[PDB]
Ligand binder design. Structure first.
Ligand SMILES: [Zn+2]
Lengths: 196, 95, 98, 50, 50, 1112
């Protein structure tokens, strides 16, 4: 479980997530659960076609009780998991940002470790997750030399973006993204270690 | 001595390889199968890399210890410890 | 190295003797093949195998792989002034003592 | 091994030496814990030799 | 006893014809021997039985 | 009931009688070889067993081969009737002279020429055969060898069943695994395509091949009318026609070839009816016949697959798919229909040494006959002789390489007789022809309800090879096919039957097996109406006392040989019992052994069969005895002499001796032990001594499994052992000259060589210290040489005018002791030596080791430990009568490990040692009702034995502890509970509370401390890697793992890591300079550039990659 969590692959549970906050309008399909949520401010409904073999989790209510069943027509907060399992870090990252995914990973690892009874301080995990999620994928290069879709650390990407903008060149559109330990370590600055 | 500010990998060139080496191998013969000695300019000839023994000319002319930096004209080899054999290279010439 | 040197000497002798373009070009191709093999065996095409159809360890094999010289410098070295023995608990020692 | 380092000839064989004539010793105390000032103890030591 | 000397024998890991137990067993048996010394110097005894 | 004549008397807590003695513990190992070679005894045994056809191994293998012939049919050869001859030399000389115990075999070959009509028959030599000694071992080149059996899945038919996750429908798969040939897989799928996979091909419908044979479509319809899915498949297939079917089959098998009827017709019989190409073992054919109940009434002779087998198999598959319970075929009796299991002992056979040797000689015979047939075809037909045909090199080479490099040829560990017996009885599951560690599933390593009675579930290696190495049960015997059996007595009508029979797995499953421990009346009547029973698989339930059919023999029918001698095994834990069993195989022979006070009754029997103890053959009277040899006079007037090896190095470095325990003028009966080998005392195993133990934490010196020993053991040689080293040097010829051992050696002081004799070797009986010279030799120097001229020139002139180096052999780092003997082999004396050698000399050094700190000790219940400290005899606690204890054990480790059995063992040992006398004037106490009438009165230092699963109960111990005989002083030390009052040796005052004491058996492990301790400051450096050597023997430094680098980085320590990586491992000038600075008072100079970095540079510069430094 810890190996999978750190590697940041597709969760086996792959629980549904609350992409947007709204009025949940869920129709229970005995074969495949179909979940829709009416946005409060407005917009369309995000649709989830999940497997029905599981047992629905609690609905976010004033009580906030685990015994409660997933009641249709209620309201949920953005990013909350609708059913038991694990949320893909990429989805929560894109819909919440880096802070929420960082804290969620820290809490999950701490919980799994406390399950066995062992205790370790959080900072030892913060030092790791800080390095893990320090990459900024770029969709377009525009006025930049680097190939679009190439991983660039946030510091250098920001430096190049500000340099090009200061001279009038258009900025490069990039977004943060995380990776597993293997991919985060395979891309470094020193060539000798990489060859090692 | 032990000061290495940086390390850069450069792409060599024919003249560079000419500069590095101290010989030009010419025959594929290994150590002799009878006298257990290198063959003239073979793949181990002392005239290229260095003496098989330490402080020992091929011909014995300057086999004495008190000789360093002296190349023997009779055999055309240098007199230094066997370690120098470990840090000298040869370059083959291509037609 | 034997193969490369031998083929170079064959090239030199052949060009000295004189011959049409076909043989010289074929011979140059053979030389290029040998150099490619020496800098790396099995990179492209059938790797050379002398014994038991066993691929040979090229020059580039000194760096990659488990025995690659890069990795072996990190697995550790055998040091001096060492010693190993069994351990038995002793309650007559201070904490900073052995 | 004490004789090993003496460097004698081949025909010498060392043997362990045990200089002790005593074999077993034991003691028991006969106490008298009355409130009188005669509170003492009597030692009964037994020894056997080779 | 400190050290013994067996004629016709060069060390302890061997035997001697005519006996029922090897040198180690006789050494173990001799360990039980008890003697008292009056002189403060190495004295020598003999044991000849045929 | 002591079967052996003069075993020591030790009454036992016997409650039940075993109706049969333990069978020959080595009969299993010897029977395979006896069958293989072929002897009258084996033939008589086979006839007794009832087998109709007595067939040997060599005869079978070399008869199934003949008659060979050429394709033209004008020539043929036959050769049968293999017979053996006498021995070359006795076993002792073969082991000592470096020869190999073997014997020649002669085969009478008949050479027939068809067209002429002549016969040429005469004996032919076919090399030597490594005969098996009476102790079931192979002596190769003087080194002992022992081959371990193997577990293989019997070739046959296995009906697998996999449940679909989506369809949720049963898919019945049947797979046939013959010895050699094609594999057939018939699987019913959701699509219903019942097809075949011949040699991992596409699933082609079964009907296609069925018709390919010409099987009439009407017969398909009628024989499969009961089947519905297969009828649908029949109606679904498109291609129809015998020619079309066979051509399609051939194209699927071999596409791109001329499709003709003859090709497919011949290929069918070639792949399914040509015995040579397609063959199955007789075991496989018999098992398949039993499975299908077809061809049961005749003895199997043809070992090829048949069409009726295939049609019956497909009928069985379809019937199983229909869900039927049992199926019937014309000519076959009713049999059940069910899926098979891989982990059932009714399928996993056992191939003994006979099978392996037979296969190896079969390969050799195939290689020989190929060349023989080619030679006869090509050689002249007129004056050809079989002597010129047969080539002996391939078979001899095959057997030699099998004995040498085959993984199933392991050196017989000989720490003690028990270890050797266990190794001979081992059951391997890996190696050549078996599964690997990674591919083998984890489930196979678990127990199976069919293991009861065949393979012990306790004994197993602790390492990763867990579950792959078992051991035969006590009463297990291999059937002539290779299926393990187990004795049973059949209850006919609720009455036990004294007569016994042997049942295999399949027959055992089909019957009802009772419980041995179930009470049974003396007349054979079941007192209990309900008796527990074992059923088909994992099922146990009470049943009336009438339907029960079979009953076990003894409670000890599932334990191994090693596990069978662990008292109170019914109280320990599985892991602890396994640990103790494994520990028992690591004892070290002491100098003065003593038989255990408490131990099972399977000790003397396990020692007699071990082979390490001699025994008289005929009842005679001893005339005289000696420490080196014995002479017994037979009653027929024939004098016989036995020679006993004294102080001969064992196969594992320990010593082995024999001390006769007989007196002059005693009529010794046949079968009576005459001498005791290592770990023996009066013809019974004794791996340790008896020590007085105490259970209490003592000043933390026994903290966390540590142990404390009294100096009395050290000063009395109670646990003193003898270890014999072994060294050898050789002088082999070289192109530059030949080396010769010589007393003289260049530039050496007279004192150094003061021990060497004239011939150049150390005199016997001279003490040697580490670093001393053990044997001298001179190595010539290298100069220019010419093969043809230098030889003559040296012969005539210039003799002994060249330099010589010194390469004398010296004692390694950390060895000492006496020199007991020197063996020298010379080529002049016509002594066989390895090619290219002239003088090989070996020296034996024997050292006596006294138990010291850092030594392992452990009881029989698997409780290891180390000697924490050896206090003086005057400091140990002592009983109220002045008897100091000999060892103290910690108490916190007993309840956590849950090995309470050792406490009971200690109590019983104390009770037996002190002697007891149970009161009987008023009558036998209720708790003493079941005690044997002769066990109520014991003597001091008595001997008792508690068989496993049947021993003294808790009430028995409670009663016995209350009647121990008083000490000679008149007082009793221990109380009823077993505790006693002690007296501290330091304080001198008694402890506030009593402590438990008693005698517990203690062994000695082989993990001594002298081997482990080692130091290295400066010494030889490797020449190729420039690093210090490794290993204690080479006097090399320790390894420095990368985890250590990580730790050093963690602390932030930099200069230390720099030194460890540069100044003490690689840098030559660095080492020299730092050593000189330390020798003087100068500060250590900073390290330099490690050799590793410079080598990496000078190597990477070779790939045209200009690697600069940029010092700037
Ligand atoms: Zn010279």
């Amino acid at each position: 479980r810890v190996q999978e969590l750190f590697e940041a692959r597709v969760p086996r549970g792959k629980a549904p997530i609350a992409d947007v906050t709204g009025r949940v309008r869920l129709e229970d399909g005995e074969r495949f659960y179909k979940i829709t949520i009416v946005p409060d401010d407005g917009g369309e409904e995000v649709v989830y076609d999940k497997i029905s073999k599981r047992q629905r989790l609690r609905v976010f209510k004033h009580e906030d009780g685990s015994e409660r069943v997933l009641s249709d027509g209620d309201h949920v907060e953005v990013g909350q998991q609708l059913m038991e399992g694990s949320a893909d870090p990429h989805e929560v990252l894109r819909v919440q940002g880096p802070r929420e995914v960082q804290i969620h990973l820290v809490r999950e690892v701490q919980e799994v470790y406390r399950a066995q009874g062992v205790s370790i301080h959080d900072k030892h995990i913060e030092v790791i997750v800080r390095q893990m999620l320090r990459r900024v994928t770029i969709i377009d290069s525009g006025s930049t030399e680097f190939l679009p879709g190439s991983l660039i650390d946030r510091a250098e990407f920001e430096a190049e973006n500000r340099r090009v903008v200061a001279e009038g060149g258009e900025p490069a559109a990039g977004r943060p993204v995380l990776m597993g330990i293997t991919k985060a370590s395979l891309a470094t600055d020193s060539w000798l270690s990489a060859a090692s | 001595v032990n000061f290495f500010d940086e390390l850069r990998i450069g792409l060599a060139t024919a003249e560079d390889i000419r500069q590095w080496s101290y010989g030009e191998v010419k025959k594929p013969e290994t150590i002799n199968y009878r006298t257990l000695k290198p063959e003239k300019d073979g793949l181990f000839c002392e005239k290229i890399f260095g003496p098989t023994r330490d402080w020992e000319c091929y011909c014995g002319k300057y086999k004495r210890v008190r000789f360093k930096g002296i190349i023997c004209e009779r055999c055309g080899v240098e007199v230094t410890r066997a370690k120098v054999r470990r840090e000298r290279m040869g370059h083959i010439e291509l037609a | 190295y034997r193969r490369v040197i031998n083929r170079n000497n064959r090239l030199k002798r052949l060009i000295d003797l004189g011959a049409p373009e076909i043989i010289v070009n074929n011979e140059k191709r053979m030389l290029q093949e040998s150099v490619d093999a020496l800098f790396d065996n099995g990179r492209r095409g059938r790797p050379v195998t002398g014994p038991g159809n066993r691929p040979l360890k090229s020059l580039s094999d000194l760096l990659k792989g488990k025995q690659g010289r890069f990795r072996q410098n990190l697995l550790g070295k055998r040091v001096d002034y060492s010693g190993r023995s069994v351990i038995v608990v002793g309650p007559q020692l201070k904490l900073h003592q052995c | 091994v004490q004789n090993r380092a003496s460097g004698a000839e081949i025909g010498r064989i060392p043997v362990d030496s045990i200089y002790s004539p005593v074999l077993k010793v034991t003691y028991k105390v006969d106490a008298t814990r009355v409130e009188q000032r005669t509170d003492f103890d009597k030692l009964i030591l037994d020894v056997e030799t080779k | 006893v400190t050290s013994i000397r067996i004629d016709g024998v060069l060390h302890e890991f061997t035997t001697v014809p005519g006996v029922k137990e090897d040198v180690t067993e006789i050494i173990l048996n001799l360990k039980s021997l008890v003697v008292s010394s009056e002189e403060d110097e190495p004295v020598t005894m003999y044991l000849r039985k045929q | 009931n002591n079967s052996v004549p003069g075993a020591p008397n030790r009454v036992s807590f016997a409650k039940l009688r075993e109706p049969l003695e333990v069978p020959g513990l080595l009969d299993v190992q010897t029977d395979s070889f006896e069958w293989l070679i072929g002897s009258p005894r084996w033939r008589e045994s086979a006839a007794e067993r009832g087998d109709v056809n007595p067939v040997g191994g060599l005869e079978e293998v070399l008869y199934e081969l003949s008659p060979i012939e050429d394709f033209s049919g004008s020539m043929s050869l036959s050769f049968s009737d293999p017979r053996f001859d006498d021995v070359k030399a006795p076993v002792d000389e073969c082991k000592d002279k470096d020869m190999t115990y073997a014997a020649p075999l002669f085969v009478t070959a008949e050479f027939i020429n068809n067209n002429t009509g002549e016969i040429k028959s005469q004996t032919v030599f076919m090399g030597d055969f490594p005969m098996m000694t009476e102790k079931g071992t192979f002596i190769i080149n003087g080194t002992e060898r022992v081959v371990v059996s193997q577990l293989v899945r019997s070739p046959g038919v296995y009906f697998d069943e996999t449940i679909d996750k989506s369809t949720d429908k049963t898919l019945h798969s049947v797979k046939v695994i013959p010895s050699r040939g094609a594999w057939l897989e018939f699987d019913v799928d959701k699509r219903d395509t019942v097809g075949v996979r011949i040699d991992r091909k596409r699933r082609q419908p079964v009907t296609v091949l069925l018709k390919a044979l010409g099987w009439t479509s009407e017969q398909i319809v009628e024989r499969f009318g009961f089947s519905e899915i297969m009828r649908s498949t029949l109606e679904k297939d498109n291609t129809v026609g015998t020619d079309e079917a066979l051509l399609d089959i051939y194209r699927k098998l071999r596409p791109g070839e001329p499709p003709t009827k003859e090709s497919a017709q011949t290929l069918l019989e070639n792949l399914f009816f040509k015995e040579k190409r397609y063959d199955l073992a007789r075991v496989g054919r018999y098992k398949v016949n039993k499975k299908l109940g077809l061809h049961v009434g005749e003895p199997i002779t043809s070992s090829t697959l048949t069409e009726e087998d295939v049609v019956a198999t497909i009928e069985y598959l379809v019937r199983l798919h229909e869900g039927q319970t049992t199926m019937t075929v014309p000519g076959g009796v009713e049999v059940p229909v069910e899926t098979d299991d891989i982990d059932h002992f009714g399928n996993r056979r056992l191939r003994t040494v006979g099978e392996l040797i037979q296969n190896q000689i079969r390969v050799g015979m195939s290689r020989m006959e190929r060349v023989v047939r080619e030679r006869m075809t090509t050689q002249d037909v007129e004056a050809i002789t079989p002597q010129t045909l047969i080539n002996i090199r391939p078979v001899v080479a095959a057997i030699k390489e099998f004995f040498g490099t085959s993984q199933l040829s392991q050196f017989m560990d000989q720490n003690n007789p028990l270890s050797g017996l266990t190794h001979k009885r081992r059951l391997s599951a890996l190696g050549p022809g078996g599964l690997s560690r990674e591919r083998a599933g984890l489930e196979v390593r678990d127990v199976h309800p069919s293991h009861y009675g065949r393979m012990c579930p306790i004994e197993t290696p602790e390492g990763p090879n867990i579950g792959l190495i078992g051991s035969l049960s006590v009463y297990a015997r291999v059937n002539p096919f290779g299926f393990i059996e187990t004795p049973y007595r059949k209850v006919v009508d609720g009455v036990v039957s004294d007569e016994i029979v042997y049942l295999t797995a399949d027959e055992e499953d089909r019957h009802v097996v009772a419980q041995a421990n179930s009470p049974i009346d003396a007349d054979g009547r079941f007192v209990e109406p309900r008796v527990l029973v074992r059923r088909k698989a994992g099922e146990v339930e009470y049943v009336p006392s009438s339907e029960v059919d079979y009953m076990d023999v003894s409670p000890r029918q599932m334990v191994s040989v090693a596990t069978a001698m662990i008292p109170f095994l019914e109280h320990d834990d599985a892991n602890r019992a396994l640990m103790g069993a494994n520990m028992q195989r690591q004892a070290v022979p002491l100098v003065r052994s003593e038989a255990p006070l408490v131990g099972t009754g399977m000790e003397l029997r396990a020692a007699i069969d071990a082979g390490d103890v001699v025994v008289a053959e005929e009842s005679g009277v001893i005339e005289e005895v000696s420490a080196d040899y014995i002479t017994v006079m037979h009653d027929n007037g024939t004098r016989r002499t036995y020679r006993m090896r004294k102080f001969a190095r064992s196969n594992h470095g320990t010593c082995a001796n024999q001390c006769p325990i007989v007196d002059a003028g005693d009529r010794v009966e046949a079968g009576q032990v005459i001498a005791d080998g290592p770990c023996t005392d009066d013809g019974e195993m004794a791996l340790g001594k008896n020590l007085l133990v105490a259970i209490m934490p003592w000043e933390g010196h026994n903290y966390e499994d540590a142990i404390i020993l009294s100096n009395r053991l050290v000063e009395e040689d109670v646990l003193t052992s003898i270890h014999i080293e072994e060294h050898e040097i050789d002088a082999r010829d070289t192109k530059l000259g030949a080396e010769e051992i010589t007393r003289d050696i260049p530039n050496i002081s007279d004192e150094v060589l003061a021990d060497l004799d004239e011939r150049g070797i150390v005199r016997i009986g001279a003490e040697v210290r580490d670093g001393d010279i053990l044997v001298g030799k001179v190595t010539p120097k290298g100069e220019t040489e010419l093969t043809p001229e230098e030889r003559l020139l040296r012969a005539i002139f210039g003799e002994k005018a060249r330099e010589v180096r010194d390469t004398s052999l010296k004692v390694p780092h950390g060895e000492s002791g006496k020199v007991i003997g020197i063996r020298v082999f010379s080529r002049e004396d016509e002594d066989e030596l390895p090619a290219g050698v002239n003088e090989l000399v070996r020296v034996y050094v024997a050292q006596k080791r006294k138990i010291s700190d850092g030594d392992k000790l452990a009881g029989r219940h698997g409780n290891k430990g180390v000697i924490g400290k050896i206090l003086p005899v005057e400091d140990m606690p002592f009983l109220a009568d002045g008897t100091p204890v000999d060892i103290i054990l910690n108490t916190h480790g007993v309840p956590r490990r849950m090995n309470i059995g050792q406490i009971l063992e200690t109590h019983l040992g104390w009770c037996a040692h002190s002697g007891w006398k149970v009161d009987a004037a008023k009558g036998v106490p209720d708790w003493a009702a079941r005690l044997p009438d002769e066990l109520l009165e014991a003597q001091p230092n008595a001997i008792v034995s508690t068989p496993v699963f049947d021993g003294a109960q808790e009430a028995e111990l409670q009663g016995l502890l209350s009647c121990t005989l008083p000490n000679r002083d008149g007082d009793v030390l221990v109380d009823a509970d077993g505790k006693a009052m002690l007296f501290d040796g330091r304080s001198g005052e008694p402890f506030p509370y009593p402590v438990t004491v008693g005698y517990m058996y203690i062994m000695k492990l082989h993990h001594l401390v002298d081997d482990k301790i080692h130091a290295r400051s400066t010494g030889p450096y490797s020449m190729i890697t420039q690093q210090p050597l490794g290993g204690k023997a080479q006097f090399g430094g320790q390894r420095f793992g990368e985890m250590e680098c990580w730790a050093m980085q963690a602390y932030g320590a930099a200069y230390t890591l720099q030194e460890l990586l540069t100044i003490k491992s690689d840098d030559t000038v660095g080492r020299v300079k730092v050593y000189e600075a330390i020798v003087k008072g100068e500060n250590i100079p900073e390290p330099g550039i490690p050799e590793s970095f410079k080598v990496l540079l000078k190597e990477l510069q070779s790939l045209c990659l200009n690697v600069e430094v940029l010092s700037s």
